[PDB]
Amino acid sequence: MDLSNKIKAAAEYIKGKSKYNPTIGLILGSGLGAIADQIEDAEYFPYNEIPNFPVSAGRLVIGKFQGKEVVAMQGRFHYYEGYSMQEVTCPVRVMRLLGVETLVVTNAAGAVNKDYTPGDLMIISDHLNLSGSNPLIGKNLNEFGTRFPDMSNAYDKDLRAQVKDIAKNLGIEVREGVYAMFSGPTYETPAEVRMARILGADAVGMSTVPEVIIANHSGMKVIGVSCMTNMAAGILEQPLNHEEVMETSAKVRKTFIELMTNIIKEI
Amino acid sequence: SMDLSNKIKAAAEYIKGKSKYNPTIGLILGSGLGAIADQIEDAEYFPYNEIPNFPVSTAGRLVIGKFQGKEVVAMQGRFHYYEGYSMQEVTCPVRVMRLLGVETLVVTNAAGAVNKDYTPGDLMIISDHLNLSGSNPLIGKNLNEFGTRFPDMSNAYDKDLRAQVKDIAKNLGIEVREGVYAMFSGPTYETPAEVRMARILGADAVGMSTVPEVIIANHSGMKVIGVSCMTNMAAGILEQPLNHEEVMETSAKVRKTFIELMTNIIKEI
Amino acid sequence: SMDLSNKIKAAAEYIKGKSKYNPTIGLILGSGLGAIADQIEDAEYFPYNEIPNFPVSTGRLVIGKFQGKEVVAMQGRFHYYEGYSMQEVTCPVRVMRLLGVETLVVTNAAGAVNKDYTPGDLMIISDHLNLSGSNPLIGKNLNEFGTRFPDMSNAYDKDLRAQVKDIAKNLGIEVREGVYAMFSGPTYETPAEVRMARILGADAVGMSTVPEVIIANHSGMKVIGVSCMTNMAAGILEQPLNHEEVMETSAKVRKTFIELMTNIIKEI
Numbered sequence: 001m002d003l004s005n006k007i008k009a010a011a012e013y014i015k016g017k018s019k020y021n022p023t024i025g026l027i028l029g030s031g032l033g034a035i036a037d038q039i040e041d042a043e044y045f046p047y048n049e050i051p052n053f054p055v056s057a058g059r060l061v062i063g064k065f066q067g068k069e070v071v072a073m074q075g076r077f078h079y080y081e082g083y084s085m086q087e088v089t090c091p092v093r094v095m096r097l098l099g100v101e102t103l104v105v106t107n108a109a110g111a112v113n114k115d116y117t118p119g120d121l122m123i124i125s126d127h128l129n130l131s132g133s134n135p136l137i138g139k140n141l142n143e144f145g146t147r148f149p150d151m152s153n154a155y156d157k158d159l160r161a162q163v164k165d166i167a168k169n170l171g172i173e174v175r176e177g178v179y180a181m182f183s184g185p186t187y188e189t190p191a192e193v194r195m196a197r198i199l200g201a202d203a204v205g206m207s208t209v210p211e212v213i214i215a216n217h218s219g220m221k222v223i224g225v226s227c228m229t230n231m232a233a234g235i236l237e238q239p240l241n242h243e244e245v246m247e248t249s250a251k252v253r254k255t256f257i258e259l260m261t262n263i264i265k266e267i
Numbered sequence: 268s269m270d271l272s273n274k275i276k277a278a279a280e281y282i283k284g285k286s287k288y289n290p291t292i293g294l295i296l297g298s299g300l301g302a303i304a305d306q307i308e309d310a311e312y313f314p315y316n317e318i319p320n321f322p323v324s325t326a327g328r329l330v331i332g333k334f335q336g337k338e339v340v341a342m343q344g345r346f347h348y349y350e351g352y353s354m355q356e357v358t359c360p361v362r363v364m365r366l367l368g369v370e371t372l373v374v375t376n377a378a379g380a381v382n383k384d385y386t387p388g389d390l391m392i393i394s395d396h397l398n399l400s401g402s403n404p405l406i407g408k409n410l411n412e413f414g415t416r417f418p419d420m421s422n423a424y425d426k427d428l429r430a431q432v433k434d435i436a437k438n439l440g441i442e443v444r445e446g447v448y449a450m451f452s453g454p455t456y457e458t459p460a461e462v463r464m465a466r467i468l469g470a471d472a473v474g475m476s477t478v479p480e481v482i483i484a485n486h487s488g489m490k491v492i493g494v495s496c497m498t499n500m501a502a503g504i505l506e507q508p509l510n511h512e513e514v515m516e517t518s519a520k521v522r523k524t525f526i527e528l529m530t531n532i533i534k535e536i
Numbered sequence: 537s538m539d540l541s542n543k544i545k546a547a548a549e550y551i552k553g554k555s556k557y558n559p560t561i562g563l564i565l566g567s568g569l570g571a572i573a574d575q576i577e578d579a580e581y582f583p584y585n586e587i588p589n590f591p592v593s594t595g596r597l598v599i600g601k602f603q604g605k606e607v608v609a610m611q612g613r614f615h616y617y618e619g620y621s622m623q624e625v626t627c628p629v630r631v632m633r634l635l636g637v638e639t640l641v642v643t644n645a646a647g648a649v650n651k652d653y654t655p656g657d658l659m660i661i662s663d664h665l666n667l668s669g670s671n672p673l674i675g676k677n678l679n680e681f682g683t684r685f686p687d688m689s690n691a692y693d694k695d696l697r698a699q700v701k702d703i704a705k706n707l708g709i710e711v712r713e714g715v716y717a718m719f720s721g722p723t724y725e726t727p728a729e730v731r732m733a734r735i736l737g738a739d740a741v742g743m744s745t746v747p748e749v750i751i752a753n754h755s756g757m758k759v760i761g762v763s764c765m766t767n768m769a770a771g772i773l774e775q776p777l778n779h780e781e782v783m784e785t786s787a788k789v790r791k792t793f794i795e796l797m798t799n800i801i802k803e804i
C-alpha cells in the first residue's frame with residue numbers, strides 16, 4: 001500500500017465508525033487537552049487501533065463543540081521522538097479525508113522576543129523551518145495538492161484578524177510574531193537563540209511547522225496560537241526545564257481555553 | 268561507495284559505447300530552460316529510463332552533439348532533492364558526465380529574486396551559494412577516483428569564467444546581475460519570513476537546486492558557471508501567491524535572450 | 537533486536553571486565569594531539585573493531601594514568617561526514633559515561649571566522665551553533681542517561697572555562713574564547729556560508745564536536761572544548777583550503793596545545 005493508500009485506509013476505517021462530518025481539526029499542544037475532553041457526544045479512536053497510524057496512548061476525539069463538528073488529537077507525534085516527517089503529519093492527511101477544512105494548531109514555545117512575558121499568547125503570523133527536513137519531500141500526492149504549494153498565507157490572514165477581534169472583545173491580551181521550529185529535543189543554546197532572533201524568530205519550538213505545511217498543501221486554512229511558557233534559553237540566567245514549561249502552560253491555561261472556545265464557535 | 272562508483276561507470280560506459288562524441292562542455296537545464304538542447308547539431312539522445320542505474324522518474328534525456336564548435340552533453344531535465352532522491356542520486360549524472368570527458372559545467376536554474384532591485388526576467392550570474400537544504404551530496408565514503416575527501420569551495424563558481432560571461436553579455440547588450448543563490452530543500456515555496464531570513468543570510472535568489480550539482484562538479488575537478496533566471500520575486504515581496512505556472516511563463520518569455528547569452532558563452536569558453 | 541540501550545551496555549561490559557580502571561575524565565582528541573594518548577601510562581588498549589557494537593571503520597580506546605588522573609582517550613573519532621548516523625558518532629560518549637567519566641575534554645581543528653584570530657590560535661568554546669541538520673538525541677530517550685529535554689544553557693561549563701583561562705595565564709599561552717559552528721561537511725564552506733556563519737554569531741567553523749557535546753551534557757557530564765584555528769575560514773583570504781595545511785598548522789602548535797591539555801587535566 002503506497003503512502004496514499006495507507007492514508008485512505010485509515011480514513012475509511014474512521015469514517016465507517018463515525019456519525020460525524022468534522023469540519024474543524026484540532027492539534028492541541030500546550031496542555032489544552034482539556035478542550036478535547038469537553039467535546040460532546042464524542043467518538044474515540046485510539047492510535048493503535050487505526051490502520052497505518054504511527055505506533056507508540058493518544059487518541060482521536062470526534063464530536064460536537066460549540067455547534068461545530070470537530071476532530072482533535074490528544075497526544076501529538078513529534079519529530080524528535082524518531083518519527084519521520086511523513087509519520088508526524090499522517091494524521092493531518094487523514095483529517096482532510098474526514099472532511100476537515102480548518103486546522104487549529106496550538107503549542108508551547110520559548111519567547112525569543114525580549115518584549116514578551118511568560119504566559120503571553122502569540123498568534124503565529126509566519127514560521128521558519130529550521131529542522132533540516134520537510135514533510136512534502138518525496139512523490140507528490142496529487143489527490144491532496146499541487147507539487148509546489150504556496151506558503152505566502154500559511155496562517156490565514158483573515159482568521160488571524162478574527163482571533164485578534166475575538167481577543168479584544170474578551171479582553172485577552174495577545175501577541176503576534178514569527179515562530180521557529182528546531183528539531184529538538186535539546187533546548188536551544190544561548191547562541192542558537194540569539195541566532196533565531198537575528199533570523200527573525202519571535203518564538204522557538206519543536207513542532208507545529210510540519211502539520212502547518214501539510215494542512216496548507218491539503219487545502220486547509222490554518223490558525224496557530226503559541227503559548228510562551230518560558231523566556232528562550234539565552235535571555236535569563238536560569239536553566240530551561242520542562243516541568244517549568246507545563247507549569248506556566250497550566251497557569252494561563254484557562255484564558256487560552258476561553259480564547260480557543262470562542263474562535264471555534266465563530267469560525 | 269563502490270556500488271555507486273560501479274553504477275556510475277556502468278552508466279558512462281553504456282553512453283560511450285553508443286556515442287560518437289567526446290564532449291568537454293556539460294549543460295544542466297531546469298525545465299523552461301531546456302530548449303537550448305534542441306539546438307545541438309546532429310545530436311544523440313539517451314532517455315534516462317534507458318541508461319543503466321540512472322534514477323527512475325515519477326521523460327528526461329541526455330542530448331549529446333555539436334554546438335558552436337564544441338562537443339557538449341546537455342541534461343534535458345534535472346533530478347531534484349524534493350522528489351525523494353538522495354543527494355547522491357541527484358548528483359550521480361554529474362559523475363557520469365565527468366567520465367564522458369566534461370571539463371566545464373554550465374548550470375542553469377529557475378529561482379525567486381530575493382534582491383528587491385531585481386526584476387522578473389533578469390539573469391543572475393551565480394557568484395556563490397548558500398546550502399540551506401539540510402543535506403550534503405558528499406556525505407558518506409569519498410569517491411577517490413573523482414576527488415579529494417575535503418574539497419575546497421572558495422571558487423565554486425569560477426571567477427575567471429564569471430568575468431568572461433560579464434564581458435560577453437556586455438558585448439551583446441544583455442543586462443545581467445551577479446549575486447548569491449540560496450538553495451532550500453523544497454518542495455514548498457518559502458514563507459515570507461524565510462525569504463527575509465534568506466536576505467539576512469546574504470542571499471539574492473532562492474531555489475531548490477544547483478547547489479548539489481555544483482558541489483559534485485567542483486569535487487570532480489570541473490569548472491562551473493551558474494546562470495539563474497529570476498522567474499518571480501521571492502515570496503512575501505509582493506502581495507501575490509507563488510505559482511509554478513508563473514515560473515514557466517517567465518522562463519518562456521526570456522528564452523530568446525537566455526539562448527543568445529549561453530550560445531555565445533559556449534562558443535567563447 | 538538488541539536495542540541501542542543494551543548495545544551500549546555490552547560495550548561497557550566488555551571494557552569493564554577487561555579493565556582495572558574507573559576513569560573520570562574523557563578525552564576526544566583530534567587536533568592531532570594523539571601524543572596525549574601516547575603519554576598515558578600503564579595503559580590498556582581497546583581497538584574499536586573489538587569493542588562490541590562500536591561503529592565500523594571503513595582507532596582505539598586508551599585507558600590509564602595521566603597527570604594524576606585516570607582517563608580514557610578516544611584516539612580517532614567518528615565523523616558525521618563519513619556517513620555515520622548521529623547515534624554511531626556519539627555512541628562512545630555513552631560508553632565513556634558508563635566507565636565513570638564525569639568530565640569531557642574535546643579538542644578539534646576549526647576555521648577561524650573571527651578576523652581577529654590568526655592561524656595557530658587556541659579558542660575556548662563558550663557555546664556552539666548546530667548547523668549540521670541533525671541531532672544525536674532524536675529518537676527514543678535513554679532514561680538511564682538523562683532527561684528528554686536537556687537544557688543547553690551551560691553546554692561548556694563556565695567554571696571550567698574560567699579555570700582554563702587561569703591555567704593559560706599562568707602558562708603564558710594566548711587564548712581566545714568564542715562560539716563554534718558545526719557544518720556537516722565534508723566540503724569546506726563557501727565564502728558566502730562563512731559570511732553567513734559570522735552573521736549568525738559564530739567565531740569558528742568545524743565538522744565535529746557538537747554531537748559529542750550534546751550527548752555529554754545529556755549524560756550529566758561537564759564539557760571543556762578547545763578549538764585550534766588551523767586556517768582562516770574560507771573567503772577571508774584569496775587562497776583555497778585543503779587538509780594538508782590544516783594538519784601543518786595543527787603540528788606547528790602541538791607543543792603549546794599539549795602543555796595546555798596536560799595542565800588542565802592535572803588541575804581539573
Ligand SMILES: O=c1[nH]cnc2c([C@@H]3N[C@H](CO)[C@@H](O)[C@H]3O)c[nH]c12
Nearest residue numbers: 108109110204205206207242245685
Ligand atoms: O524554549 C523552548 N524551546 C523549544 N521547545 C519548547 C517548548 C515546548 N514544550 C516542550 C518542551 O518544553 C516541547 O513540546 C517543546 O516544543 C516549550 N519551550 C520551549
Ligand SMILES: O=c1[nH]cnc2c([C@@H]3N[C@H](CO)[C@@H](O)[C@H]3O)c[nH]c12
Nearest residue numbers: 377378379473474475476501511514
Ligand atoms: O521562488 C522560488 N522558490 C523556490 N524555488 C523556485 C523555483 C524553482 N522552480 C521550481 C518551482 O517552480 C523548483 O524546481 C524550484 O527550484 C523558481 N522560483 C522559486
Ligand SMILES: O=c1[nH]cnc2c([C@@H]3N[C@H](CO)[C@@H](O)[C@H]3O)c[nH]c12
Nearest residue numbers: 417645646647741742743744779782
Ligand atoms: O575551515 C574549516 N571548516 C570546516 N572544517 C574544518 C577543519 C577540520 N579538519 C578537517 C577538515 O580539514 C575536519 O575534521 C574539520 O572538522 C579544519 N578547518 C576547517
